Symmetry: D2
């Protein structure tokens, strides 16, 4: 089954002033679309290989699949993780706030740690807040590229893209300012919904019921 | 604030010599007691550093500690899946039925085509790593990929349902450099019942986490 | 003796000297922000090693060496990158001399070389570099990619011509279109510099190993 | 267009059993005859694909083939340095003199401090890789780093003069999981004469190179 580019949940200019329209348009129509196409291209090669029509370098094509699939799913989460300022921004409540209190000692400490993780990604990558199916707790990590340092199990519920293309046109080299500004468009309702699903569904995938 | 729940080393589902002749007792023992244990400890040690940082007790390099967490957590979960993915010959080995066989037929064109591809993926991991059969929550289909170390090339979303460890420590004492022979022999201990149960859970649970 | 500090080199030309192919704002940010950050990071890693050697602190050796690796590599790669370019006239065109001779022998001529090098640069996954290197084991040219600054690079190979395809190298001008950037970059290649490096490599490299 | 010069497997500088009791004969045989040979073949195979691409016979994935070249070339050169970096106990082992000892004193505050740092670097490689002592052409000083696989974390410029292989295949048959004991014992076969000769060449050639 082939991957498809999802529409954004909002207008290309909907995250302004925090992320400009030009970035949103390039990011979605070029970058994300390229990962969708790359993932499908890798699958097509695997198909031709399985049908015996070609012989592929299995390692190489799977590396291509890994990178592009990861790019696709990460951007798929990234867009609805944001919302126009109002619906987006502010401080979380509910289950997310509760786990943030338990795991990190409150929102301010969480924000400082998450921001540090995002700002200090070496090269391009992501800051990731994930739900751990083994402990049913939150974990923060970095991902390099789309597919380096990511682990099995951990379910991303909030991600920030710190690839240079995510901010350079507006913030230039100042990734720090981008990260600080990104908090203003975080869709906590989306994160809350993701956590609800993870609490219900994640653990049984690994520790059988 | 509540102190993190510690990771723990699970027992094996069988004795150390239970996978003979395909994987020797000495490997199973070292693999479990030394290697898997080390990843459990490493994951806990990283979380302890994060805890002390959050309590204002120490300085940490956030990137470094998270790299440590990534590698060791990944090692832990991958081995946690690896052990029950195998079973003593008899319960282990053979060819799958059920939903696993159905998806293998529809996607890979049958078990032999799947086996050849999975074996090639495992054999050709560059350096140490894993061959992985995963459930894709976006398409509700199977995908095969490689993972290097424990935490390189792995992606979000994909749920491993069957993994083969091709780190050198998984085979060297018995098979020496001949990883190919190890991979071929490993099929004789695959626990298809476990794989089927994992797929069942994924079919029921995975997609809603993301969409 | 305290380690010798790395230093930011001046550019061989003004910030606007590579126009219209690479705009002034890019050259300024690239040199003053990005390259300077790698210099500072390389020095910072060695300061940590020094405090460890003085017995004052205990460090995570793996972590600090990863920092050294990335930042040292960033520093050296950019150090080669700047003089690898020159204002159009001195920069651009088709090489002669020893480099042209090896290009004929290894790659079957300049057009074939250019196509291969361009493909290598364009298809770097994530951020990184296209690299033309001298192989001390064979005394021949080899092309490879480097991801980040310090992934896929090998011992031995001496880079003689590099192109930076990190997003910051082109995004402000070329946006997502790395391909057009790579095509344009040829017009500022300083072939006299590449020639000097190859000659040094032919005379110096093999004995090291 | 002339066909590429092939990489070749260098012979060992000593018998397969010459590093005993510190590294057993079986490891040396497998390591040289199976593993190193595989990297030589892999590097050549990648270049063959590049050749066929340039001659218009095939259309390659340039990234994929260059990744193959990178890993295998790196494997080849790292092992090529690794073997003569060791010597039978007597010629091998002990502590360095000459220029190596001089820079070690200046950079690291002496041999025991250097040894502690290099040992820690080797023991703490995550996954498989190498501990590396390198000469920096930019500063004409020694640097220690790790390399993962053969071709991850390695940088341009730095010239390895002493390397230790900590891939599992380098020790597992003898030391099992105990990489630490392997690293501790490897010091007893280090060929300081070889390292000294490499440093001499680096001091003479590396900076003028860059
Ligand atoms: Mn992006
Ligand atoms: Mn293992
Ligand atoms: Mn750059
Ligand atoms: Mn080796």
């Amino acid at each position: 089954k082939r991957y498809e580019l999802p529409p954004l949940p909002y207008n290309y200019n909907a995250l302004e002033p925090y992320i400009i329209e030009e970035i949103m348009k390039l990011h979605h129509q070029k970058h994300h679309n390229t990962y969708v196409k790359g993932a499908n291209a890798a699958l097509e090669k695997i198909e031709k290989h399985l049908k015996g029509e070609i012989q592929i370098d299995v390692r190489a094509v799977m590396r291509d699949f890994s990178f592009n699939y990861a790019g696709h799913i990460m951007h798929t989460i990234f867009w609805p993780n944001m919302a126009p300022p109002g619906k987006g921004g502010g401080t979380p409540g509910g289950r997310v706030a509760d786990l943030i209190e338990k795991q990190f000692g409150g929102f301010e400490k969480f924000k400082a740690l998450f921001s540090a993780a995002a700002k200090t990604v070496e090269g391009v990558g992501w800051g990731v807040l994930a739900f751990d199916p083994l402990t049913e707790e939150l974990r923060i990590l970095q991902v390099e590229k789309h597919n380096v340092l990511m682990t099995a199990g951990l379910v991303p519920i909030l991600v920030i893209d710190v690839w240079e293309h995510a901010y350079y046109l507006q913030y230039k080299n100042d990734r720090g300012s981008y990260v600080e500004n990104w908090w203003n468009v975080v869709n906590w309702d989306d994160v809350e919904k993701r956590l609800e699903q993870a609490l219900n569904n994640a653990k049984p995938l690994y520790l059988l019921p």
